[PDB]
Every structure is written in structure tokens, then in C-alpha cells.
Amino acid sequence: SFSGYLKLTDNVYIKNADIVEEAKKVKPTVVVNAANVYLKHGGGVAGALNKATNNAMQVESDDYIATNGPLKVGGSCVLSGHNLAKHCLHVVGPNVNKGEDIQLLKSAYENFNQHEVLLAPLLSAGIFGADPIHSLRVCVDTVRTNVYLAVFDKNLYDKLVSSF
Numbered sequence: 251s252f253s254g255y256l257k258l259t260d261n262v263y264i265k266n267a268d269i270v271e272e273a274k275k276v277k278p279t280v281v282v283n284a285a286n287v288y289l290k291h292g293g294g295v296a297g298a299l300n301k302a303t304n305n306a307m308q309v310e311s312d313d314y315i316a317t318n319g320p321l322k323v324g325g326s327c328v329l330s331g332h333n334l335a336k337h338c339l340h341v342v343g344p345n346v347n348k349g350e351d352i353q354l355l356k357s358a359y360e361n362f363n364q365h366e367v368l369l370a371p372l373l374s375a376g377i378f379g380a381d382p383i384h385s386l387r388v389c390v391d392t393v394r395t396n397v398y399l400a401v402f403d404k405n406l407y408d409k410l411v412s413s414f
């Protein structure tokens with residue numbers, strides 16, 4: 251199962267790790283993607299997860315969007331996890347760099363409660379522009395299921411743990 255995680259609360263765990271490498275190692279039931287409403291996996295965690303699937307995630311996502319239209323900010327969809335996980339839960343956190351409401355970050359984390367255990371990044375962190383310390387606080391105060399957070403950046407990981 252998951253190894254090397256620091257336990258933050260009853261159900262939240264954190265590790266300085268590349269979520270793609272972590273997914274390939276664990277092959278969890280659910281890996282969370284830091285998705286956008288169009289499921290265009292260009293950069294950040296989404297670009298890295300999609301590149302690891304050899305673009306199969308993007309091909310599946312384009313078919314999903316063609317059928318269903320875009321997701322809502324704060325919403326999610328379950329698609330295949332390809333070679334990374336059984337499923338990928340594509341969750342759209344608000345993108346502060348697009349002027350999206352940070353209050354939607356709690357709604358985004360509520361999607362995690364539909365899955366008993368997940369490997370995830372901090373929503374709205376990185377290229378989404380939100381403060382990762384705030385994202386971790388919303389995560390611990392919203393998610394009730396078992397969430398294993400992978401934080402790519404060591405310096406950010408140390409800051410998140412030391413300020414928790």
C-alpha cells in the first residue's frame with residue numbers, strides 16, 4: 251500500500267513525491283487529477299499524468315467532453331486511471347490565475363468524499379495559483395475519506411508540514 255507518508259490527521263497523509271511516480275508504484279484505486287473544466291491536460295499535475303498515459307488520458311477526456319460538455323469549477327468526473335490507477339478522479343479546483351472563486355476549493359475537495367481512499371495532489375496549488383497552505387487546510391477540514399497527498403516540491407512539502 252502507501253509508504254513513507256507523514257500522518258497529518260485521522261485521515262490525511264502527506265509525502266514529498268511525484269504523483270506520477272507514486273501512482274505507478276502504488277497503482278491506487280483512485281488517483282486525483284488537478285483538472286480544468288475542459289479536461290485539457292496541458293501542464294502541472296494534469297500534463298504530467300497525461301504524459302505518463304502516453305496521451306490516452308487526453309483521448310479519453312476529449313471523448314468525455316464531446317459527449318458531456320465541460321465540468322463545473324468545483325466538480326469532478328471519474329474516468330479510467332489507465333496505467334496509473336484503476337480510476338482517475340478529475341477534480342476541478344478554482345484557478346486563481348483565471349479569477350475563479352477560491353471558495354469553490356471546498357466544493358472541489360468534497361468530491362474526494364465519494365472515494366474511500368485516494369492518491370491526490372493539493373487542489374488549486376501550483377499553476378492554479380492558490381496558496382498551498384490554504385489548500386491543505388481546506389483538504390483536512392473537508393475530506394473525511396483517506397487521502398494520501400503527494401507534494402512534488404520538497405521546499406513546499408517542508409513548509410506545509412512545519413506550518414500545519
Ligand SMILES: C[C@@H]1[C@H](C#N)CCCN1S(C)(=O)=O
Nearest residue numbers: 363364365366367394395396
Ligand atoms: C468517511 C466515509 C463516509 C463519509 N464522508 C462516511 C461513512 C464512512 N466512510 S468510508 C470509511 O466508507 O470511506
